Design an enzyme around this catalytic site. Structure first.
Site, PDB file in Angstrom:
ATOM      1  N   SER A   1      30.008  35.731  26.380  1.00  0.00           N
ATOM      2  CA  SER A   1      31.305  35.158  26.148  1.00  0.00           C
ATOM      3  C   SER A   1      32.359  34.804  27.005  1.00  0.00           C
ATOM      4  O   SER A   1      32.837  33.775  27.437  1.00  0.00           O
ATOM      5  CB  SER A   1      32.446  36.301  25.578  1.00  0.00           C
ATOM      6  OG  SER A   1      33.519  36.571  25.758  1.00  0.00           O
TER       7      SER A   1
ATOM      8  N   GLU B   1      45.641  11.994  24.773  1.00  0.00           N
ATOM      9  CA  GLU B   1      45.521  10.973  24.812  1.00  0.00           C
ATOM     10  C   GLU B   1      46.973  10.974  25.364  1.00  0.00           C
ATOM     11  O   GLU B   1      47.751  11.205  25.364  1.00  0.00           O
ATOM     12  CB  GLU B   1      45.386  10.180  23.396  1.00  0.00           C
ATOM     13  CG  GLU B   1      45.710   8.259  23.642  1.00  0.00           C
ATOM     14  CD  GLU B   1      45.780   7.403  22.409  1.00  0.00           C
ATOM     15  OE1 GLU B   1      45.271   7.978  21.298  1.00  0.00           O
ATOM     16  OE2 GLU B   1      46.798   6.616  22.575  1.00  0.00           O
TER      17      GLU B   1
ATOM     18  N   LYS C   1      37.339  33.630  41.546  1.00  0.00           N
ATOM     19  CA  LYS C   1      38.157  32.822  42.945  1.00  0.00           C
ATOM     20  C   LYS C   1      39.788  33.829  42.805  1.00  0.00           C
ATOM     21  O   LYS C   1      39.727  34.757  43.650  1.00  0.00           O
ATOM     22  CB  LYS C   1      38.206  31.809  43.185  1.00  0.00           C
ATOM     23  CG  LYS C   1      39.373  31.496  44.417  1.00  0.00           C
ATOM     24  CD  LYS C   1      39.807  30.187  44.789  1.00  0.00           C
ATOM     25  CE  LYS C   1      39.712  29.328  46.383  1.00  0.00           C
ATOM     26  NZ  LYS C   1      38.311  29.637  46.668  1.00  0.00           N
TER      27      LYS C   1
ATOM     28  N   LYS D   1      41.489  23.765  34.506  1.00  0.00           N
ATOM     29  CA  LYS D   1      41.102  23.041  35.970  1.00  0.00           C
ATOM     30  C   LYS D   1      41.582  21.955  34.477  1.00  0.00           C
ATOM     31  O   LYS D   1      41.265  21.721  33.572  1.00  0.00           O
ATOM     32  CB  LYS D   1      39.845  22.125  36.564  1.00  0.00           C
ATOM     33  CG  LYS D   1      40.181  21.785  36.957  1.00  0.00           C
ATOM     34  CD  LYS D   1      40.472  21.305  38.212  1.00  0.00           C
ATOM     35  CE  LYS D   1      40.689  22.074  39.291  1.00  0.00           C
ATOM     36  NZ  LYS D   1      40.718  21.497  40.521  1.00  0.00           N
TER      37      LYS D   1
ATOM     38  N   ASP E   1      46.423  18.281  42.939  1.00  0.00           N
ATOM     39  CA  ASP E   1      44.688  18.160  43.492  1.00  0.00           C
ATOM     40  C   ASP E   1      44.637  16.849  43.736  1.00  0.00           C
ATOM     41  O   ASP E   1      45.030  16.035  44.368  1.00  0.00           O
ATOM     42  CB  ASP E   1      44.179  18.885  42.323  1.00  0.00           C
ATOM     43  CG  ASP E   1      42.358  19.220  42.316  1.00  0.00           C
ATOM     44  OD1 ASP E   1      41.563  18.597  42.724  1.00  0.00           O
ATOM     45  OD2 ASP E   1      42.466  20.396  42.088  1.00  0.00           O
TER      46      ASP E   1
ATOM     47  N   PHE F   1      38.614  18.221  61.238  1.00  0.00           N
ATOM     48  CA  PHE F   1      39.720  18.027  61.127  1.00  0.00           C
ATOM     49  C   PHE F   1      40.981  17.693  60.559  1.00  0.00           C
ATOM     50  O   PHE F   1      41.636  16.989  61.276  1.00  0.00           O
ATOM     51  CB  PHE F   1      39.912  17.225  62.345  1.00  0.00           C
ATOM     52  CG  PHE F   1      40.586  18.285  64.042  1.00  0.00           C
ATOM     53  CD1 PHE F   1      40.442  19.381  64.050  1.00  0.00           C
ATOM     54  CD2 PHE F   1      41.367  16.862  64.556  1.00  0.00           C
ATOM     55  CE1 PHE F   1      42.084  20.499  65.252  1.00  0.00           C
ATOM     56  CE2 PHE F   1      42.467  18.078  65.725  1.00  0.00           C
ATOM     57  CZ  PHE F   1      42.654  18.988  66.129  1.00  0.00           C
TER      58      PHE F   1
ATOM     59  N   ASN G   1      43.397  18.546  57.162  1.00  0.00           N
ATOM     60  CA  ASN G   1      44.865  20.568  56.841  1.00  0.00           C
ATOM     61  C   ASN G   1      43.826  21.907  57.252  1.00  0.00           C
ATOM     62  O   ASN G   1      44.756  22.384  57.880  1.00  0.00           O
ATOM     63  CB  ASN G   1      45.175  20.425  55.452  1.00  0.00           C
ATOM     64  CG  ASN G   1      45.641  20.908  55.239  1.00  0.00           C
ATOM     65  OD1 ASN G   1      47.009  21.086  55.998  1.00  0.00           O
ATOM     66  ND2 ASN G   1      45.124  21.902  54.310  1.00  0.00           N
ATOM     67  N   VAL G   2      42.820  21.538  56.982  1.00  0.00           N
ATOM     68  CA  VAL G   2      42.413  23.017  57.060  1.00  0.00           C
ATOM     69  C   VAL G   2      41.674  23.449  58.420  1.00  0.00           C
ATOM     70  O   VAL G   2      42.242  24.277  59.512  1.00  0.00           O
ATOM     71  CB  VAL G   2      40.719  23.150  56.094  1.00  0.00           C
ATOM     72  CG1 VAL G   2      39.931  24.363  56.415  1.00  0.00           C
ATOM     73  CG2 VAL G   2      41.365  22.962  54.537  1.00  0.00           C
TER      74      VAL G   2
HETATM   75  N1  LIG Z   1      38.745  25.449  47.704  1.00  0.00           N
HETATM   76  C1  LIG Z   1      39.696  25.720  48.444  1.00  0.00           C
HETATM   77  O1  LIG Z   1      41.257  26.469  48.009  1.00  0.00           O
HETATM   78  C2  LIG Z   1      40.134  24.647  49.812  1.00  0.00           C
HETATM   79  C3  LIG Z   1      41.603  24.815  50.039  1.00  0.00           C
HETATM   80  C4  LIG Z   1      41.409  23.985  51.203  1.00  0.00           C
HETATM   81  C5  LIG Z   1      40.858  23.003  51.039  1.00  0.00           C
HETATM   82  N2  LIG Z   1      39.455  23.011  50.572  1.00  0.00           N
HETATM   83  C6  LIG Z   1      38.084  22.151  51.221  1.00  0.00           C
HETATM   84  O2  LIG Z   1      38.515  22.380  52.282  1.00  0.00           O
HETATM   85  C7  LIG Z   1      37.770  21.101  52.698  1.00  0.00           C
HETATM   86  C8  LIG Z   1      38.483  20.185  54.210  1.00  0.00           C
HETATM   87  O3  LIG Z   1      39.899  19.479  53.429  1.00  0.00           O
HETATM   88  P1  LIG Z   1      41.000  19.213  54.262  1.00  0.00           P
HETATM   89  O4  LIG Z   1      42.198  19.373  52.807  1.00  0.00           O
HETATM   90  O5  LIG Z   1      41.197  19.991  56.084  1.00  0.00           O
HETATM   91  O6  LIG Z   1      40.813  18.576  54.211  1.00  0.00           O
HETATM   92  P2  LIG Z   1      41.455  16.562  54.843  1.00  0.00           P
HETATM   93  O7  LIG Z   1      41.252  15.552  53.956  1.00  0.00           O
HETATM   94  O8  LIG Z   1      42.804  16.918  55.208  1.00  0.00           O
HETATM   95  O9  LIG Z   1      40.158  16.403  56.205  1.00  0.00           O
HETATM   96  C9  LIG Z   1      38.757  16.498  55.627  1.00  0.00           C
HETATM   97  C10 LIG Z   1      38.544  16.159  57.307  1.00  0.00           C
HETATM   98  O10 LIG Z   1      36.713  16.416  57.279  1.00  0.00           O
HETATM   99  C11 LIG Z   1      36.553  15.418  58.206  1.00  0.00           C
HETATM  100  N3  LIG Z   1      35.452  14.985  57.474  1.00  0.00           N
HETATM  101  C12 LIG Z   1      34.919  13.578  55.901  1.00  0.00           C
HETATM  102  N4  LIG Z   1      34.313  13.450  55.910  1.00  0.00           N
HETATM  103  C13 LIG Z   1      33.308  14.129  57.707  1.00  0.00           C
HETATM  104  C14 LIG Z   1      31.830  14.188  57.920  1.00  0.00           C
HETATM  105  N5  LIG Z   1      30.305  13.581  56.909  1.00  0.00           N
HETATM  106  N6  LIG Z   1      31.416  14.355  58.531  1.00  0.00           N
HETATM  107  C15 LIG Z   1      32.626  15.531  59.472  1.00  0.00           C
HETATM  108  N7  LIG Z   1      33.871  15.384  59.246  1.00  0.00           N
HETATM  109  C16 LIG Z   1      33.955  15.256  58.479  1.00  0.00           C
HETATM  110  C17 LIG Z   1      37.521  13.969  57.963  1.00  0.00           C
HETATM  111  O11 LIG Z   1      37.772  12.736  59.473  1.00  0.00           O
HETATM  112  C18 LIG Z   1      38.895  15.136  58.567  1.00  0.00           C
HETATM  113  O12 LIG Z   1      39.080  15.656  60.043  1.00  0.00           O
HETATM  114  C19 LIG Z   1      37.294  20.179  51.248  1.00  0.00           C
HETATM  115  O13 LIG Z   1      36.278  20.764  51.904  1.00  0.00           O
HETATM  116  C20 LIG Z   1      38.265  20.441  50.937  1.00  0.00           C
HETATM  117  O14 LIG Z   1      37.771  20.639  49.878  1.00  0.00           O
HETATM  118  C21 LIG Z   1      39.245  23.913  49.789  1.00  0.00           C
HETATM  119 CA   LIG Z   2      35.308  33.448  27.149  1.00  0.00          CA
HETATM  120 CA   LIG Z   3      44.712   7.333  19.503  1.00  0.00          CA
END
Ligand SMILES: NC(=O)c1ccc[n+]([C@@H]2O[C@H](COP(=O)([O-])OP(=O)(O)OC[C@H]3O[C@@H](n4cnc5c(N)ncnc54)[C@H](O)[C@@H]3O)[C@@H](O)[C@H]2O)c1
Ligand SMILES: [Ca+2]
Ligand SMILES: [Ca+2]
Ligand SMILES: NC(=O)c1ccc[n+]([C@@H]2O[C@H](COP(=O)([O-])OP(=O)(O)OC[C@H]3O[C@@H](n4cnc5c(N)ncnc54)[C@H](O)[C@@H]3O)[C@@H](O)[C@H]2O)c1
Ligand SMILES: NC(=O)c1ccc[n+]([C@@H]2O[C@H](COP(=O)([O-])OP(=O)(O)OC[C@H]3O[C@@H](n4cnc5c(N)ncnc54)[C@H](O)[C@@H]3O)[C@@H](O)[C@H]2O)c1
Ligand SMILES: O=C(O)c1cccc(C(=O)O)c1
Ligand SMILES: [Ca+2]
Ligand code: NA
Ligand code: NA
Lengths: 413, 405, 411
Positions: C27, C38, C90, C102, C142, C214, C216-217
Site C-alpha cells: 500500500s 491536457e 522526507k 510532485k 522546482d 558554490f 545557493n546551498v
Molecule cells: N532536496 C532538497 O530539498 C534540496 C534543496 C536545495 C538543493 N538541493 C540540491 O543541492 C544541490 C545544489 O543546489 P543549489 O541550489 O546550490 O544549486 P545551484 O544551481 O544554485 O548551484 C549549483 C552549484 O554546483 C556547481 N557545480 C555544478 N556542476 C558541478 C560539477 N560537476 N562539479 C562541481 N561543482 C559543480 C555549480 O557551479 C554551482 O556552484 C543540487 O543537487 C540540488 O538539487 C536539494
Molecule cells: Ca499508498
Molecule cells: Ca483532448
C-alpha cells in the site's frame, strides 16, 4: 458646500498617479472598483409596515488581500460616498502595510429614526443580501458611522447561518463574540500616535497644543480622551446636536461621563455652549475633524485658524481646501494614515480569530504602535524622494504598493 | 439538576424566557448505524448527538459507546459541558453523543466499521467550527483517528474536527497529564489566594489513575507531602510523605499500593477522614455525604472526580470552614488542553510540551481569578460562583447575538 | 534516474529494518492518486500548443501533500513517482505534517514567452484546482518554475476558491512569501552539522571543511560555517576550484562572486584539481553540487571523517559501503538539506495563521526543527543499531506507517 466626494477623491488619486508617473492603462485599472453591489433591503417596522432601503457594498481592490472596510448607516450614504471610501480603504491598508484590499458599504438610513429591533432586522437582511459576496478570505466588514459592535454581532450571527460559525468574517465584534481588546479605542488612539509622530518632527508635544474636535462618537471620544490624557488642551467639541467650548480646556473625562448619562454637549457645566458651525474656524492649534467628509472646502478654508489638521474622519478636506490651507502654512496629516489605527487593529482581530486563539491586550497595543510608527517613517521617506506634502506622501506610498501587487499577479485569464 | 440551574439563573437575574431558551438544546440527532459483522450478518444500533449550545463557539463533547442510554442524562451532560467550557473561557459550547452498543461484543474491525458509518451519518452535523467530538466512556484515541479519517473523505483533511487524537495524527503533547496537572495548577491558584503554597501542605488522594497519578506527581515535585493514597484495591500511607516517584515506579511494575515498601499499608475506607490539609477525590463520585462529612480533617477539598460531594456535605463542610474547589472547574485541564489541540491543528503548527503547560497554567489561573471575583460579586461559594460564571457568559453571548430572524 | 534508485533502495532497506508487513508495504508504495491533464493554450501568435501537465500525489496519511512543479520536457513517470514518494519520507524525517507530491508540465519553458508561460500556468491551475488546496496538496517551485509562477497559480486558484495564500509556497514576499528562504537550505545544513558535532562535544570551529558547489546551498553553507569559525580549506564549482590550508576568506570570496568573479580566479587561494575536492584533506566534506559524485572509484581516497550530504544523492551505494567501512560518518541528504522544505512549511504556516514572522523567528524555528530531527534520528540509530542514513529513513517510514495503520483500512 461639499464637493462631490468621489470627484474630490479621484482628484487626489490623479495627483498621486501623476507623481508616480503611472501609465493611463494601469491607472484606469486601479481606479475602477473590482465590484459594485447595490441590493434591496426591505424590512417590517415594529408596527408591521414595510420600509425599503438600498444597501451598498463597493469592493474596490483586492490585489493585496481580502478587502476591508466598514459599513455606514447615515442618511447621506450614496454610491459616490461609498465608492470614495472604498478607494481610500485600498490605499490606507497599503499605507500601514497590512495584507488587505479596500471595500466599503452602507445603507442610506438614519439610525436615530429606527428602533433597535428594526436596526437588527435591517442589519440581518443586509447580511442575507451580501453573504455570498463577503467572507473571511474575501471581504471583511466592520463598523463605521452609525454602526457599532452590536451591529457587527448581528452580521456575524446572520452570516454564520449561511457559512457556519465565522468569527473572522467581521471585525469590531464584541469581546464576548471574538472581538479584540483594543479595537474600540483603536482609531482615536491611532490618531494620537500619528499626531505624536508628526509633532516629534517639530520638537513639539501634544501637551503644548490646543485642539478643536468635530464629532464625538467612536473616533471623536477616544481621540479626545487620549489627547486629554497626554495633557492636550481640548478647547472645543461639537456633534450633530451642539457644541461646547472652554479656552482653558474642557475636562474631557467629565464630558464623557456627562455624555454617557445622556447629556448634550451644549448643556455641559464645564464649558460654554457654542454654535457647532463655529467649530472648524475656532481658534486652536490643531483641528481634528471626526465626523463627515468634505467639511473643509473652498468656502471656509481661508478662515481655519489651526496650523495642523489631523484627519481622523475620512476625507474631511477636499482638494480646493488643501491648496488654500497649504498657502496659509497649514500642515495636514492625511486620513489614509492618521485614522488607520482602526483597520490595523481590525487586522489583529482577524488574525486572532483565524488563529483560533486570542492575544494578550499588550500585544495588540505593541503592534499598533509598531505599525503606526513604521508607516509614519515610510511616509517621511516617500515625501523626501517625491518632494511632496504629507497627503501625497502617504497616498503615493499606498498606491505604489497596490500597483506592485497588481503587476505581480498579472492579467491573463 | 433542575432546581440548581434555577438558583444560578435567579442569582444572575436572567429572564424566564431566556432561561427557557438556554434549556432547550440547539439540536438533537438520532441516526441508524448498521454494519456487517465480521461474519457478514447485520447489526443495527442508534447513534445520537445532542448539540446543546453554540452561542460561544462550536459545540464540543464526548462520544460514548455504551448500552445504557438515558436521553435525559445525555441532555444533562451536554448542558454541563456548555457551562464548563464557559467556566474556563474556551470558545465552545456543549454537546454529548454516542452509540447504544456494548463494545465488548464487537471485534476491533466491527468497532471501526461502526465508527465510520456513524461518522458518515453525522458528518454534515459536525465540523471544525460546528461540533468537535472527543473520547468518552467506551471510545479512545483510535476511535477519534477513525472519525478523522472518515470525515476527511467528505470535507478534506480536517485534523481539528476531533480532539483526543493520537500524537501521530495531530494530538497534543501534554494530553495525558493535562487533567492531573490542571488540578495542581488550580490548587496553586486557590492556595495563592489564601497565601499558601503546595510545599507547606499535606495531601490525601483517593484514586491513583490518570488523574491521581499525575496530580500526585505534580504535587510531589512541588514539595507537597502526599501522606495517603488509595485506589480500588488498597491504600498506603506515610506521615512524612510518600516518595511518589518510587510509588509510580512500583505501580508500573504491576505492583499494588498496599505492598509498597516506602509506606504503611492503610484501610482504603479511612482515606477521606485521613489527617491532611488537602483532600483530593480522584476516583468516584458520591463519596462525601451526610454520614461522613463531619469527619473530614482537611481544610481544602479539591474535587477532581465528578460530583464527589453532595449538597448535605457541602453544607456540613461549610460550617466547618472547609473550602471546596468544585469539579466543574478543578478537573477542566483535560478539556482546556483539548482546546489547545484544536488551536494547534487550526494553525497547522504544533506546540512543544512547555508551551502547552504554560497555556494550561495561564488558563487555569485566570479562570480561578474569574471564579473568585464572581464569588465576591454575588457573595456565593466557589461552586456557585463557577456555575454562575459559566452560565452568565453563555447568557451574555446569547443576548448579544440576538433573536431576530 | 538518480532519485528512483536511491529512494527505492533506501525504502526497501528501511522497511526490512522495521519489519513492516508486506501488505502495508505494498500500500505504501502505491500512490494515493496520479493525475495527468491536457494543458492547451494559444501562443502569442494565436496558434495552439498542447502540453500534458501532471501531479503525482503519493501519500497524505500525515497531512496535506507537498511538492514542486517542474516545467521541463523530459517526464519519466517512474522518476516523478519516486520523487513524490521521497517527499513523503522526507517530510516525515523532519516531523512536518505533510505527505509527498510532485507535479509539472512536459514543456520547455525556453520555447515560451513570458505571457505564454503565464497562460500555461493559469490553464494548468484551472485543470488541477479541484485536486489541490491548502489542506489537500500545496505546490511549490522546482526546475523551470519560480515565485512568479507561484503568483500566477495563487491568482488563478483564488478565482475558484477566494484568496488562498497557503495554496502554494515559494511565493513573492508581496503575496505572502516567507523571509529566510534563500538561506534556508545552506543554513539548515549548518544547523544539522552543529547538532551532529555536539555528539562529540565538538563544534564547527574545531573543523576544516571542503565544499563542492558554490551556488545557493554552497554559498550560504560556506558563509554560516565561516562565521562559526569553521575553516573552509577548499571550494569548487563547475568551472574550477581553489584551496587554502589556512582557510579561504569566505567573506571576500562572496564579494568576489557578487562582483561576477569566477571562483577559480579568486586571489585568496591556490588553484586545484576540482577532482581532488572530494578527496581533499579536510575534517568535513560537504557535497553541494551534483548527485553521483562519490562512487566506488574515489570513495577509498576520501580523507574526511564527516560527509554532510547537501546535494541530492551525492553518495552511491558502493561508496556508502566503502565509507562506512573506513569509519566515515555520513549525515544523509534526506535530512541534511531539509531546511528548504522546512521553511516552505513555515511559509504555509504563516499564511494559515494570517500573519508573517520576522526572519529571526524563521531561523529560530528552523534550528529547532533541524535539531529535534537530528535527535530523533540519533535515537532511532540506537534503537536499530544502524547508521544515520537508515536511522533517518526508518524514522520517516515508521511515522508514515504508524499514521497509516492508525487511520485504518475499513471503508
Ligand atoms: N532536496 C532538497 O530539498 C534540496 C534543496 C536545495 C538543493 N538541493 C540540491 O543541492 C544541490 C545544489 O543546489 P543549489 O541550489 O546550490 O544549486 P545551484 O544551481 O544554485 O548551484 C549549483 C552549484 O554546483 C556547481 N557545480 C555544478 N556542476 C558541478 C560539477 N560537476 N562539479 C562541481 N561543482 C559543480 C555549480 O557551479 C554551482 O556552484 C543540487 O543537487 C540540488 O538539487 C536539494
Ligand atoms: Ca499508498
Ligand atoms: Ca483532448
Ligand atoms: N469607527 C472607526 O473605527 C473608524 C475608523 C477610521 C475612520 N473612521 C471615520 O471617522 C468618522 C466618524 O466615525 P465614527 O465611528 O466616530 O462614527 P459614530 O457614528 O461613532 O459618530 C459620529 C459622530 O459625528 C457626529 N456628527 C455627525 N454629523 C455631524 C455634523 N454634521 N457635524 C458635527 N458632528 C457630526 C455625530 O453626532 C457623532 O458624534 C467617519 O468619517 C468614519 O468614516 C471611523
Ligand atoms: N472532563 C472531566 O470532567 C473529567 C476529566 C477526567 C476525569 N474526570 C473524573 O475523574 C475521575 C477519575 O478519572 P481517571 O481518568 O483518573 O480514572 P482512571 O480509570 O484512570 O482511574 C480511576 C482510579 O480510581 C480508583 N478507584 C476506583 N474506584 C475506587 C474506590 N471506590 N475507592 C478508591 N479508589 C477507587 C481506581 O483503582 C483508579 O486508581 C473520573 O471517574 C471522573 O469522575 C473528569
Ligand atoms: O475595517 C475596519 O475596521 C474599519 C472600520 C471603519 C472604518 C475604517 C476606515 O479605515 O475608515 C476601517
Ligand atoms: Ca437553546
Ligand atoms: Na469476515
Ligand atoms: Na498576440
Amino acid at each position: 458646500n461639499a464637493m462631490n466626494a468621489l470627484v474630490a477623491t479621484n482628484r487626489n488619486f490623479q495627483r498621486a498617479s501623476r507623481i508616480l508617473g503611472l501609465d493611463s492603462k494601469l491607472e484606469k485599472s486601479l481606479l475602477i472598483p473590482y465590484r459594485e453591489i447595490k441590493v434591496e433591503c426591505t424590512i417590517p417596522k415594529d408596527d408591521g409596515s414595510l420600509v425599503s432601503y438600498v444597501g451598498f457594498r463597493i469592493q474596490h481592490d483586492n490585489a493585496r488581500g481580502p478587502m476591508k472596510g466598514g459599513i455606514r448607516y447615515h442618511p447621506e450614504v450614496d454610491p459616490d460616498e461609498v465608492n470614495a471610501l472604498a478607494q481610500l480603504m485600498t490605499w490606507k491598508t497599503a499605507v500601514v502595510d497590512i495584507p488587505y484590499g479596500g471595500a466599503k458599504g452602507g445603507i442610506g438610513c438614519n439610525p436615530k429614526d429606527l428602533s433597535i429591533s428594526e436596526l437588527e432586522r435591517l442589519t440581518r437582511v443586509f447580511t442575507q443580501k451580501i453573504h455570498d459576496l463577503i467572507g473571511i478570505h474575501r471581504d471583511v466588514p466592520a463598523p463605521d458611522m452609525g454602526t457599532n459592535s452590536q451591529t457587527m454581532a448581528w452580521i456575524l450571527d446572520e452570516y454564520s447561518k449561511f457559512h457556519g460559525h465565522s468569527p473572522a468574517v467581521v471585525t469590531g465584534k464584541p469581546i464576548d463574540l471574538g472581538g479584540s481588546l483594543g479595537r474600540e479605542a483603536a482609531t482615536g488612539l491611532g490618531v494620537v500616535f500619528a499626531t505624536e509622530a508628526l509633532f516629534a518632527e517639530y520638537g513639539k508635544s501634544i501637551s503644548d497644543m490646543t485642539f478643536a474636535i468635530q464629532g464625538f462618537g467612536n473616533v471623536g471620544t477616544w481621540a479626545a480622551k487620549a489627547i486629554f490624557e497626554r495633557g492636550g488642551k481640548v478647547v472645543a467639541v461639537s456633534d450633530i446636536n451642539g457644541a461646547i467650548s472652554n479656552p482653558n480646556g474642557i475636562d474631557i473625562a467629565a464630558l464623557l461621563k456627562h455624555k454617557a448619562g445622556n447629556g448634550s454637549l451644549k448643556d455641559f457645566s464645564g464649558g460654554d455652549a457654542m454654535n457647532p458651525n463655529d467649530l472648524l474656524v475656532h481658534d486652536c492649534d490643531v483641528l481634528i475633524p471626526c465626523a463627515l467628509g468634505g467639511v473643509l472646502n473652498k468656502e471656509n478654508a481661508n478662515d481655519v485658524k489651526a496650523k495642523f489638521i489631523i484627519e481622523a474622519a475620512n476625507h474631511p478636506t477636499d482638494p480646493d481646501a488643501d491648496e488654500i490651507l497649504s498657502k496659509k502654512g497649514v500642515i495636514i496629516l492625511p486620513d489614509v494614515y492618521a485614522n488607520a489605527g482602526g483597520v490595523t487593529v481590525s487586522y489583529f482581530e482577524w488574525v486572532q480569530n483565524i488563529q483560533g486563539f486570542m492575544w494578550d491586550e499588550e500585544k495588540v497595543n505593541q503592534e499598533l504602535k509598531r505599525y503606526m510608527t513604521k508607516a509614519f517613517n515610510d511616509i517621511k521617506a516617500n515625501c523626501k524622494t517625491h518632494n511632496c506634502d504629507l497627503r501625497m506622501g502617504a497616498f503615493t506610498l499606498g498606491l505604489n504598493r497596490v500597483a506592485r501587487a497588481t503587476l505581480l499577479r498579472g492579467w491573463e485569464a
